[PDB]
């Protein structure tokens, strides 16, 4: 009756759905999952088989008395009921020999329900591709039974090395992540098809483990009767869950403490350090609290929503965890970096949005987290901060901390550890967190960030040294935790990279691309009739999946000369050849509006910089171009726009991708066949087009005279359209001509 077999059963719950949708037998899919798993390499114990085979209340109210009290599957049944947010008291299970119901239906999307009352409710689907770029297309896709049979063979070949152990839970989870991400949990129903099988299984595993921890701290054993002989509407009122979050504070002021030489590599080092440090502390609280990584709902940029059990054991563990974490931050990053741990008490009605109160979980959590950010120290921290003293302790040159320095270079040690790991992450493959190493992390666990050869030996079944890596070849042999990051280094240097840009001006291009109001879409972008923990999980899953995998795919598939550093809707930071930055911004917009299916938008700012410009000033100036794009509007009273190289050239994505780019391609088409006219004629054209602002009428007349005078060589059609564009939209053709001359320099 331990919860490890419970979380394994709750994860392997609804494995019968895929093999019902694939195979030949048409029975109750719960039986199919049960004998599928019992006919594996081991006949797994009854603890798994009652969770897998015996759920779905109609199936277990028939055979009940032979089944035990304290039987560990009733909590799986109620976790499956709560994760859908559905009302499964009367509704049947697919494959109950009822009638003709569908077999091959495609997964929906959480982006079509998103922003329903303004941006409409579309109805798209995810076609199957045999981590492929799968954007939703409105054509009605169907998964053929060979896809499910291939899924069966893949999970058979993966699960053979996987048996119920404490270290196999994350490997089984990432197996579910790789396989069932495009398997719909619902079939032939309402719009419950839009949640994946993996996301619903992760949510029901987290809720099942939390319910068991609540039961084993609040002394409930006869829970079969208070589910079934008396209905559990009284349990739904019980505040049985916590939902905790982290917020890192001061992330931007930390990652932008950069310098002269080795500026950009230090920014990668600090951004990666803070993100993976947040991932490690969010995993380590689950390790101290004896939970799986399914209880994590999201670990994004600077924040980490969890889900726990409302027990005094959990509250005590949270308090003496956050004291140690606060002491470790105030040991090194004195008031600069701080993480805030606040948690609300949440019942079972409001995870279903039953009587309302779903969004108030997030509201109470953010109010408590803002209250923690205000009242962030007790008197002991403040008193020790005031009384704190040291040795000589000069200041870092790249960082600025009054810490003890090191020899021959006279710098901070956080600065130096970030430098050495930044040398290690020039090969971005695998990171190790052991009790000794080069980069300090709490609690007394230092990274080395080694390579895969010395990390194969290092796992001696130590059961404490966690290995984080981005690449997974074989699931069972590795047994490590997967971490997302956007890391496409085209060259890792810019001298040779900007030397092999042939026909343009050798300038760096920097891009920023904030997402327009992802916070508001996170809070109330999804309507109340379709609101549950599954959709709130899978929507953040979808956006993190895009920004940490899909743009890596996009940079790889057409070899754009772009180095990427950040990843997320919070911020992005790409630097590379300016022609590739400008030619990639539009396709990033088009593929973001195809992934989010015209629901979420972006706001980029592009800047042209010289190759040896300070990277801190490059980032600050393109942040100015970013917020110039986010402040874009017409005269009354549209926030998606791109800022090109200067704060006054603010065009929307429609204007850049259509008007500027069609004009530029027409100018490039009509000025490559002529061997004389540009660029002297084009410079004399710009010299009066930019003079229309100060002297309007005479420059328009001189434009007319020049175009009719020298239409003898460029053609009467091109001169007429140059005059008509220069009379209608002058602001656009000036930008098109400027980019054309910058692209044809030398």
């Amino acid at each position: 009756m331990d919860k490890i077999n419970l979380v394994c059963g709750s994860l392997l719950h609804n494995i019968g759905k895929i093999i019902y949708r694939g195979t030949s037998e048409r029975a109750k899919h719960s039986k199919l999952g049960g004998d599928f798993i019992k006919s594996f390499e081991q006949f797994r114990n009854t603890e798994l088989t009652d969770c897998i085979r015996y759920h779905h209340a109609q199936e277990i109210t028939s055979v009940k008395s032979n089944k035990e009290k304290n039987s560990l599957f009733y909590i799986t049944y109620i976790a499956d009921n709560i994760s859908s947010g559905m009302d499964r008291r009367k509704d049947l299970e697919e494959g109950a020999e009822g009638f003709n119901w569908d077999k091959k239906v495609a997964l929906g999307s959480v982006f079509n329900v998103l922003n329903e009352k303004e941006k409409g409710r579309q109805n798209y689907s995810y076609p199957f591709v045999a981590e492929p770029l799968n954007f939703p297309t409105a054509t009605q896709n169907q998964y053929t039974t060979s896809y499910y049979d291939g899924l069966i063979t893949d999970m058979k070949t993966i699960l053979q090395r996987l048996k119920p152990d404490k270290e196999h839970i994350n490997s089984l989870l990432q197996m579910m992540e790789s396989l069932w991400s495009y398997v719909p949990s619902s079939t032939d129903k309402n719009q419950l098809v839009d949640i994946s099988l993996y996301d619903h299984s992760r949510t029901t595993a987290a809720i099942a483990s939390a319910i068991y921890d609540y039961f084993q701290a609040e002394n409930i054993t006869d829970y079969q009767k208070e589910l079934f002989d008396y209905n559990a509407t009284e349990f739904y009122d019980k505040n049985a869950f916590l939902m905790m979050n982290f917020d890192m504070s001061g992330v931007q002021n930390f990652i932008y403490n950069i310098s002269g030489s080795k500026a950009l590599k230090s920014l990668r080092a600090r951004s990666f350090y803070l993100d993976m440090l947040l991932e490690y502390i969010s995993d380590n609280l689950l390790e101290k609290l004896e939970l799986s990584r399914a209880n994590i709902l999201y670990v994004g940029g600077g924040h980490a929503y969890l889900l726990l059990a409302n027990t005094n054991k959990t509250k005590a563990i949270l308090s003496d965890f956050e004291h140690d974490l606060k002491t470790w931050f105030l040991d090194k990053f004195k008031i600069d970096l701080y993480v805030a741990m606040a948690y609300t008490e949440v019942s079972a009605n409001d995870l279903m949005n039953h009587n309302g109160h779903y969004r108030d979980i997030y509201r109470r959590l953010s109010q408590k987290t803002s209250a923690k950010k205000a009242n962030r120290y007790t008197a002991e921290e403040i008193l020790n901060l005031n009384h704190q003293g040291t040795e000589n302790a000069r200041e870092c040159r790249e960082c600025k901390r009054s810490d003890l320095l090191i020899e021959e270079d006279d710098i901070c040690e956080i600065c130096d550890s970030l430098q050495k790991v930044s040398r290690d992450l020039t090969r971005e493959n695998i990171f190790v967190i052991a009790n000794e190493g080069v980069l300090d992390m709490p609690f007394g666990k230092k990274m080395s960030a080694l390579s895969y050869s010395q990390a194969d030996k290092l796992k001696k079944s130590n059961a404490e040294v966690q290995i984080y890596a981005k690449n997974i070849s074989e699931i069972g042999q590795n047994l490590m935790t997967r971490i997302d990051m956007g890391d496409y280094t085209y060259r890792s240097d810019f001298h040779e990279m900007l030397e092999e840009v042939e026909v343009g001006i050798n300038r760096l291009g920097v891009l920023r691309a904030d997402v327009d109001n992802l916070g508001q879409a996170f809070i109330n972008g999804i309507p109340d009739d379709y609101l549950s923990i599954s959709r709130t999980a899978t929507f953040s899953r979808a956006m993190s999946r895009f920004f940490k995998n899909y743009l890596n795919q996009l940079l790889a598939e057409k070899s754009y000369k772009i180095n990427v550093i950040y990843a997320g809707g919070d911020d992005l930071f790409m630097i590379g050849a300016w022609q590739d930055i400008l030619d990639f911004s539009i396709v990033l917009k088009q593929k973001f509006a195809d992934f989010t299916q015209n629901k979420l938008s972006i706001s980029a700012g592009i800047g042209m910089f010289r190759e040896k410009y300070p990277v801190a000033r490059m980032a600050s100036l393109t942040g100015d171009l970013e917020d110039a794009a986010k402040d874009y509007k017409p005269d009354e009273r549209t926030k998606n726009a791109v800022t090109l190289f200067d704060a006054t050239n603010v065009f929307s994505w429609d204007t850049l991708e259509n008007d500027i780019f069609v004009k530029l391609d027409a100018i490039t088409k009509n000025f490559e066949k002529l061997d004389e006219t540009g660029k002297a004629f084009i410079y004399r054209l710009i010299d009066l087009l930019r003079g229309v602002n100060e002297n309007q009428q005479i420059n328009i007349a001189r434009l007319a005279y020049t175009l009719s005078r020298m239409e003898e060589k460029i053609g009467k059609t091109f001169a007429q359209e140059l005059y008509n564009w220069a009379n209608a939209d002058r602001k656009t053709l000036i930008m098109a001509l400027e980019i054309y001359i910058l692209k044809t320099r030398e």
Binding site: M608, F645, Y683, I686, E738, I741, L742
Partner: protein
């Protein structure tokens, strides 16, 4: 006692000054001149005037030695000879914009330059934005009198720095024909306190 050294810099040439991170278009001024961030008048920073005066004074007064007659004027923060700076330079803005609109000219011009490669004889045109010549610049340099014994030598040294700056440029592309300034209407007036021997200071300058 705080004395105010008041005067006026008149430009006998262009005097391009200062640097900006501002973006330049293709046919447009690269390296524009520094301006005030609100009024957009052309501006001489106090740091540029201070550094050029220190450069000329330390070039002349030192003969292969810095001794203290420059550190007492401009300050130092070295390891042992720390001195509080007596002179307090200020950011100088354009004074006679009313004069330039009488002559129907703006406050600044665009100078067109290029370079010729000696191997391929190709030009390389640049546009540098200078202040126009004949624009006055009214400044105020606050002097902090605390050693009444050496105010005579310090104001002699300030006048020597002014008349050494009368023969060199004030900033920017100085060797290639810009930057030439001239000082006029130099006068000293006690701000707080009442200094007795202000006539000898105003006769060191006002001559």
């Amino acid at each position: 006692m705080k004395l105010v050294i008041e005067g006026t810099i008149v430009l006998k040439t262009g005097m391009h000054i200062g640097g900006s991170s501002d973006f330049s278009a293709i046919g447009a001024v690269a390296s524009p001149v520094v301006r005030d961030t609100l009024t957009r008048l052309p501006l001489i920073p106090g740091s540029s005037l201070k550094g050029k005066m220190r450069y000329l004074l330390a070039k002349e007064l030192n003969n292969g030695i810095d001794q203290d007659e420059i550190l007492r004027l401009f300050g130092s923060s070295e390891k042992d000879k720390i001195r509080r700076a007596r002179l307090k330079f200020n950011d100088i803005k354009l004074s006679n914009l009313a004069e330039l609109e009488t002559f129907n000219v703006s406050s600044t011009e665009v100078k067109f330059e290029n370079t010729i490669n000696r191997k391929t004889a190709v030009a390389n045109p640049r546009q540098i934005e200078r202040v126009i010549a004949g624009s006055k610049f009214d400044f105020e340099i606050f002097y902090n009198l605390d050693d009444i014994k050496e105010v005579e030598k310090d104001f002699e040294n300030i006048k020597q720095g002014f008349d050494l700056l009368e023969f060199d440029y004030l900033g920017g592309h100085g060797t290639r024909g810009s930057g030439r300034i001239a000082f006029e209407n130099l006068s000293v007036i006690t701000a707080v306190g009442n200094f007795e021997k202000i006539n000898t200071l105003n006769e060191i300058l006002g001559a």
